[PDB]
Every structure is written in C-alpha cells, then in structure tokens.
From a paper:
Structurally, 14-3-3 binds ERα by recognizing phospho-T594, the penultimate residue on the C-terminus of ERα. Since ERα is phosphorylated on the penultimate residue, the binding interface to 14-3-3, creates a large, solvent-exposed pocket that can accommodate a small molecule.
Crystal structures were solved for 28, 32, and 33 and were compared as overlays with analog 21. The -Me group on the imidazopyridine ring of 28 was expected to contribute to hydrophobic interactions with Val595 of ERα. This upward movement affected the conformation of L218, which moved upwards but maintained contact with 28. The movement in the pocket also altered the interactions of the double-ortho-substituted aryl ring; while the o-Cl still interacted with I219 on the roof of the binding site, the o-Me group moved further away from F119 in the bottom of the pocket, and the interaction was lost. The direct hydrogen bond between the amide and N42 and the water-mediated bond between the aniline nitrogen and the carboxylic acid of Val595 were maintained. Overall, the changes in binding mode were associated with slower binding, but a similar apparent Kd in the MS assay.
Residue numbers in the entry:
A (entry chain A), C (entry chain A): -4 to 231
B (entry chain B), D (entry chain B): 591 to 595
C-alpha cells in the first residue's frame, strides 16, 4: 500500500518512534505496512501492532460514547429539536470506528491467524479478533448485531480452548484473554453470572500457580490478576 | 467501565 | 471545499460537538469550513477556531519535540548509527505541522484579517498570526528563519499597537497577546530582557485597573495575570 | 516550557 516502498525494519523502527511521540495513528499505519510485508510477527512486533490499534480505537470509542450520550438526551421528552447534526456526527465517528475495526480484522484474516501455529501467537491474534468484533458489537443496532456478537464469542472461545490446553494459568496472554472475555459476557452478551464465574475461576487458578514464578513473572501476572479483582469488585 | 487489556 | 455542501450553522454546531468529544482535528476541519463560507466570525466562533487549531498544532509540537530530542541524541559522540529513519520521521511530523500553520495563516489572510475592523477581532486575529509564525519559527533551520521570525514579530507588534490604543489593560485578549509576545521574545528572538520587561509592565498595568472590574471580569483577568507571574518566576 | 494562551 502506501508503505509498500519502505523496508520492514524501517517500519518497525518508526512504529517505535511513533509510540514514544504518542502518534498512535502513525504507529498503526506503520504496523499495518509491516504486516502487509507478509512475514510473521515476533512477540515484540505483535505487541506494537496491538498497542497502536488499541489506542486509535480507544479514542474513537470514547468519542462515540460522548456523542451517543448527547444524542440520547436529544430524544428525551421536553428536549428541543436541534436537527440532524448530532446523529450525523455520531454516524461519522461510528463509521470511522467501524473502518478501523474492519482494517484490523482484515489483517488478522489476511493472513496473521492462518500462519500462527504457536499457541502464544495464535491465542494473541484470536483475542484481538474477539476484541475488535466486541468493539463492532458496542455500536451495532441492526439485523447483524447477533452475528457480530457470535463472531466475537467464537473467536474468544477458540482462544480460550487453546490457552487452557497449552499455557499455564498465570500466563499474561491467558489472563488478559480471560479478563476481556469476561467483560464480553457482562457488557455485550447480557451474561453477568458467566462474567463473574469466569473472572473468579481465572483469578483462583492463577493464584495457585504463582509459586512457580520468578520475581518478574510474578509481577506481571499479579498486575493482571488485580484487574480481574477490580472487575469482580465492580460487579459484586 | 470495566478493565480490559 | 470538503465542507462546501454543509450549512454554516451545522458546521458551528458540529465544531461544538467535536470539542465535547475531544476530536480536535474534526473541530478544526468544521471551523475551516465555516470560515470559508465568507462571513465574519462572532466572538464565540473565533474562539472555536482558535481552540481547534491550538489543540491540533499543540499535539504536533509535542511530538516534534520528542522526535527532535531523539535525533539530537543520535548525533552525539559514541552514538551508534541507526540510519535515516529518525530524521525522516521528524521531517514527516515537521511537514505536517508546517501544513497546519500554513492552513491557519491562509484563513487569516483570506480573508479574516482584512474584514476585521473592530479592535477586539483584529487584535485576536493578529495574535493568531503571530502565534502560527512563532510555531513555524520553532522548527525553522534554513535561509528563511529570519524572515519567519520577522513575520511573527510584525504581527504581534501591530496587535500590540492596536490593543494599547483601544483596549483596557485588563482586557483578556490584550493580556494573552502580551503573554505570548513576551514568550516570543524569550524563546524565539533571544531577547530575555525584553520578555521580562514586557511581562512585568503588563502585569503591573493590569493590577492598577482591576478596581474597575466586575467579579467575573476580575476572575478572568487575574487568571491570565497569574500566567505572566509564572513566567516571570521561571525567568528570574 | 513557558505559559502561552
Ligand atoms: C508477545 C507477548 O507475550 N505479548 C504480551 C504479553 C504480555 C502483555 C501484558 N503484560 C502485562 C502485565 C500487566 C498488565 C496490567 C498488563 N499486561 C499486558 N497486557 C496485555 C496486552 C497489551 C495484550 C494481551 C494480553 C495482555 Cl495481559 C502484553 C503483551
Ligand atoms: C471573543 C473573545 O473575547 N475571545 C476570548 C476572550 C478571552 C479568552 C480567555 N479568557 C481567559 C481567562 C483565563 C485564562 C487563563 C485564559 N483565558 C483566555 N484565553 C485566551 C485565548 C484562548 C485566546 C486569546 C487570549 C486569551 Cl486570554 C479567550 C477567548
Ligand atoms: Ca526488504
Ligand atoms: Ca458530520
Ligand atoms: Ca507459522
Ligand atoms: Ca446557507
Ligand atoms: Ca516517515
Ligand atoms: Ca468587518
């Protein structure tokens, strides 16, 4: 594409610079270019891809929520008519958000997931697939919402099955996947009991395996465990 | 909003 | 342009929404569209234009500073060669920054300043002209740096002459202009004594006029006076 | 950096 003439290594180098400068749209474009070179991504490179898109879509989501709240208020009794502008602008932001999600899902489908054989890479990519279908689900209102939800669920479930068979219960990828799938259950699938059960079981099984870890691994795992606990506290 | 990573 | 088919009032409405959603690139594009309708801007509308571009260029400047610092470190003794990428990416960011400054200066020249007759509007626009030439000066390194600096100086000076004749010493526009021109002197023109003198004289003349103000006007003026004091404390 | 508005 636009990055077709730049070396893969230069793309990675500039993604790292963009991260330092908090230029996440540029970071995402550089990492998209790197993926489109066709080679598999290292662990570090996967992390750069995920950070860039997480920050781009995270800003979009926050803006969409602001605009949706204004639009909801505009449709309450006693609200004065202000015309089509709030809906139009929410729609603009939504369409941009959907386009970013479609871009990431496209990279995963062409061809990151099919070439990912090791458990750690495959689980990482399937978690991303679940996440970006989840973001699509957050804004979905039509005859495809059910199918979008099912696409998220299916990706997360495949990732969960792999992680349980192939990774220890303290593995950060495994833990982060569970955290996010539990949020899926609570916020998207209208399954708060499933969300709570998953968070609890994940936390407890990780706790029992902490004794096997180095100091630095212990720090990583306990940080994510605290996020599970924070959600449990919010929900109970 | 709940925590995700 | 791209906004040619949207009503002026709808552009203003969406700029306000974009502000609430912290979508400052969208806000800037909406206000550019509004200016290009050809009508003069109200006080509120001028403020929307300035906020949008300030936030866009402010992010660019922060990213440019990060990248410039990395580039400077790359050219120290004992630094390993890493290739052209740091310079190329700093150049990309710089070119984008210059393009935003050129866009704003273009709006001021076509035709906001020439149609601005009231002191408050003319001073506001000339302050912006000084500011965006100042941002150009921050990144200028070639045979035009002197001319860019002189363009900033000239705009600020015209604004200062008007403000002194036509506005009270507590007027927020007058105060903010002085604050920024004093920074110009310190950071751009290598004139720290001029910067300090201007900040001090501005502060003292405002203090002597506070007695004339309402509670709400007093609050506005004293807030900006505190910024003058903060700079004086930094510089002395 | 110094304050500007
Ligand atoms: C290649 C690879 O293993 N990538 C990877 C591993 C672990 C993380 C990660 N580690 C931590 C530790 C603490 C916290 C609060 C979060 N955290 C993450 N975040 C994360 C990400 C960004 C993606 C998927 C799972 C996790 Cl846990 C990051 C990347
Ligand atoms: C139309 C018009 O008068 N615009 C206008 C007036 C005043 C301000 C302004 N008021 C304050 C009060 C306190 C502080 C800390 C800052 N401040 C501003 N900022 C400002 C701006 C954004 C532009 C030019 C001068 C000033 Cl002072 C804003 C807009
Ligand atoms: Ca190559
Ligand atoms: Ca719109
Ligand atoms: Ca493979
Ligand atoms: Ca019209
Ligand atoms: Ca570049
Ligand atoms: Ca006029």
């Amino acid at each position: 594409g636009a990055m077709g003439s730049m070396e893969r290594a230069s793309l990675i180098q500039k993604a790292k610079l963009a991260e330092q400068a908090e230029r996440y749209e540029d970071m995402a474009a550089f990492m998209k270019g790197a993926v489109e070179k066709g080679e598999e991504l290292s662990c570090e490179e996967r992390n750069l891809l995920s950070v860039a898109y997480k920050n781009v879509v995270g800003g979009q989501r926050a803006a969409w929520r602001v605009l949706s709240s204004i639009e909801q208020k505009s449709n309450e009794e006693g609200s004065e008519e202000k015309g089509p502008e709030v809906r139009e602008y929410r729609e603009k932001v939504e369409t941009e958000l959907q386009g970013v999600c479609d871009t990431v899902l496209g990279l995963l489908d062409s061809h990151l997931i099919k070439e990912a054989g090791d458990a750690e890479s495959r689980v990482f990519y399937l978690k991303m697939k679940g996440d970006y279908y989840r973001y699509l689900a957050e804004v979905a209102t039509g005859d495809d919402k059910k199918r979008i939800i099912d696409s998220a669920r299916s990706a997360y479930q495949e990732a969960m099955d792999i992680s349980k068979k192939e990774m220890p219960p303290t593995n950060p990828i495994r833990l982060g996947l569970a955290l996010n799938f539990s949020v899926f259950h609570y916020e998207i699938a209208n399954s708060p009991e499933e969300a709570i059960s998953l968070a609890k079981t994940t936390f407890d099984e990780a706790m029992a395996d902490l004794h096997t870890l180095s100091e630095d691994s212990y720090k990583d795992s306990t940080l994510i465990m605290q996020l599970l606990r924070d959600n449990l506290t919010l929900w109970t | 909003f709940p925590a995700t990573v």
